Amino acid sequence: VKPHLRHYQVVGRESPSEKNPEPTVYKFEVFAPNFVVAKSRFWRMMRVKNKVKATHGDVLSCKVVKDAKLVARNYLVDIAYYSQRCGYTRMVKEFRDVSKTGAVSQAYHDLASRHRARYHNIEVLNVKSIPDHEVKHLSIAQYHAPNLSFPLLQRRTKATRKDRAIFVKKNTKRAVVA
Amino acid sequence: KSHYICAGRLVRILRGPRQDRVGVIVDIVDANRVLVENPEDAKMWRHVQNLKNVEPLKYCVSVSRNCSAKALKDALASSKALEKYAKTRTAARVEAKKACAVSTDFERYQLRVARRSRAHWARKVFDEKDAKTPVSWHKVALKKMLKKAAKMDSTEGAKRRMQKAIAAR
Amino acid sequence: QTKQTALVRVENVNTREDATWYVGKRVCYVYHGKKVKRCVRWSKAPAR
Amino acid sequence: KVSRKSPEYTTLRKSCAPGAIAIILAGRFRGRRAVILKQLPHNGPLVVSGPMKYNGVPIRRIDSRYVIATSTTVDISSVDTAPITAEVFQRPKAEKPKKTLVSDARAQLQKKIDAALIAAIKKDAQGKEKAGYLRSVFTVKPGDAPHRWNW
RNA sequence: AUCGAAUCGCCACCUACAAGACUGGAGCUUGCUCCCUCGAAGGCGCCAAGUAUAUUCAUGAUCACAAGACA
RNA sequence: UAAGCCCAAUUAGUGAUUGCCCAUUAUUCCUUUGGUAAGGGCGGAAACAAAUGGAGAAAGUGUAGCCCUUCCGAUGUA
């Protein structure tokens, strides 16, 4: 499937005033399902870092950065997540994917499965494609072999929806009840 | 033996909008995904396919991982993988399925009479052979009964009953 | 339940697109009673 | 543009064009293939006379909703079809109270129409196969998916 | 014998078996190559006992439980 | 090869942003009833026998409500 998180760049600033005639402009990278969530994360980060509230700020732009051409890559995703028991835990993981959005979406799925971390407690510090020789985990580097080949075993091939059947003869393809 | 998922492996798409199309593995992402492409198919540009949706065929072209479009096209044309695949029975079955799917009522009628014509002539040929070498239930039953019947009928009393009740008819 | 609307499962119709093709088609439930009562073409076709 | 009150106004679908071969879905001749001759005026029913010699279907009118008009057609421009009027199927009032009885004029119309229809079928390149097509009987088999078929 | 009924695919080719980490067969190089019947159909049945030279079908009048049904 | 847990989709790297099922809820249609209800008509226009277009038309709280159009509400112990 196509990734559920889109790559957003949000450019914004504090609204000009007399104390700050030319407020600093800030650029933010975030992976959000939609631009409303992307703007919400931007204003949260502005409040916690730059002490700027959304009620006194402007959003100069909020646009999607397109994915590059789909190529089998290795992505280094620097991510962090909060938990009550451990506070903020930061990890740097590697994934095999074809796009930044796919790798980040995979990282969010991994965090949810292996650490029960939801989207709103996760902060993506960085994500970048890395060379084969910079990969440390063998579970990722095993896909760099020039002659990677394996069979397809223990596969549940389901027929096309129109041709699916309830009762089929034992050693034929004839659908008795469909 | 089963065909491995390797760079250059030819696959058929099992389900989805590209059902029953052929492509080349070209690259492997992870345990679940590949990057399939076929220059000769209109809808088979380089795209991501899940490994659960692909059927690995028996042909592997000689390409490297993440190869260029020109390199793939030259390898495909040189290997003759698509031409070799077109001659197999599975490819013919796939093409025939499309013919049935787009067939009209007249074409369905033509297939019906053609199959019935073959069925009739199969019955004729089977009858000709079954007369000589009994293999059906009725011919086998007749061939077993014949020897005892001839012995049971070759008596004087059998002749009298046969002649009397036939001349009566 | 709401008895004014019936649900019918038709053989070889296993997709919503398949069921769309049958929208507006006539549906008939056949049964028998105990006595022979009036039917269509009772006089015209007594064999019915 | 054409007046809705005129005898020439029609709304019939394109598939039920004159010369097309239709599958009868209801009535005495259900399952039989027949040839569409015309539509009676005032957006009336179709008139089918898929030759009685081939399948037993006489010149009968039928509502277009009770027919599947297949894409296989026959050029019947040589068939007159003019004598087939709305008056042919009208009947006199019956007052207050075994070979089939057919009026002589109905018999002549059937004779001429069927003969011309048969000749047009012969003229077709696939005529012998289409004549067998007209003799064929349509039925819904176990496992059939008519909703998935092209016609 | 009441009894009019609802059911609408037949078979003496499916109607044996087992395995889905793999059962068409080989080679060694163990995932590739080669051979084959080329690994994605149980057989019939759907209106001339067969694909042709044909042939009675109506007025049961335009839908109505097929007005019949031993394939 | 969950019909368990966490996350994420709506027929899926194809070409766009509504998978499906259940309310005395929502929208809409018909009918009833009550309004802090809103309007219109009510000086019989003309003409018209039967044998062979009709009927009604009340200045009105409340009736079989004078008639018509329109809008809104409608559950409930003591």
Next chain:
RNA sequence: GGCCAGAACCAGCCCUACUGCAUUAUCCUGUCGGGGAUCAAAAUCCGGCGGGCAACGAAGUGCAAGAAUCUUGGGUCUUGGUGAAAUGAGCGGAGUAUUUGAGCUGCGCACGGCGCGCCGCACGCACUGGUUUCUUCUCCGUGAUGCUCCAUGUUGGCGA
């Protein structure tokens, strides 16, 4: 026939099929160098430089007003009707025109970059500018002298 049923159309609703504007650069290409991994390559990856439209079935990115008339979608046993005032872009007449948009461009002014007026201007505002090269249909028409209600099809079945 004040009964049952099927097709027709009419109006109103309810579902759909048909899509344009803007955006895309952390992108697309070619080349040099590095780096990589090979039996040798190639690729993933990092820089410099030169070109750019990943291109309308490119993108699952923001907004979409696309007359079911042209080009006869489906439903209404979920509404009322068969013309007892059919207000219709739909019905009736009249004429091949009308001006919407899109392209291409005139002057002025706004707008953007450089520090005084110079350059640009994606094509904004006024002249309801011009060109009509592409794309459209256009105009006119029926009061109630009807206060209210009811009353006007087609094909079979059943009813003599």
